[PDB]
Nucleic acid binder design. Sequence first.
DNA 1: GATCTGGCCTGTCTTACACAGTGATGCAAATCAAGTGTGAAGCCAGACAAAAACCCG
Length: 36
Amino acid sequence: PSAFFLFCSEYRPKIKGEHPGIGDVAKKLGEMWNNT
DNA sequence: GATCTGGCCTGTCTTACACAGTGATGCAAATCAAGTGTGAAGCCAGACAAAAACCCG
């Protein structure tokens, strides 16, 4: 486990509520994680 | 005529030299640690009908 893995496991429901479908969801997650 | 001597011939060590090994490093690269999230396949229950080869009348 790493910081990115923890952030993903913590904010996956965010992308879930945002878009159902997870290419674009994971892309946006990685983008916002690299931004923050 | 009787030895004395310089120059090849050739079987000798003798000696350097590259290679094969042992071990360990050490970077380039393929794969995986988990996160969902679909998304396309594989097979099975329900009962009903088409190609291909060998033997008999």
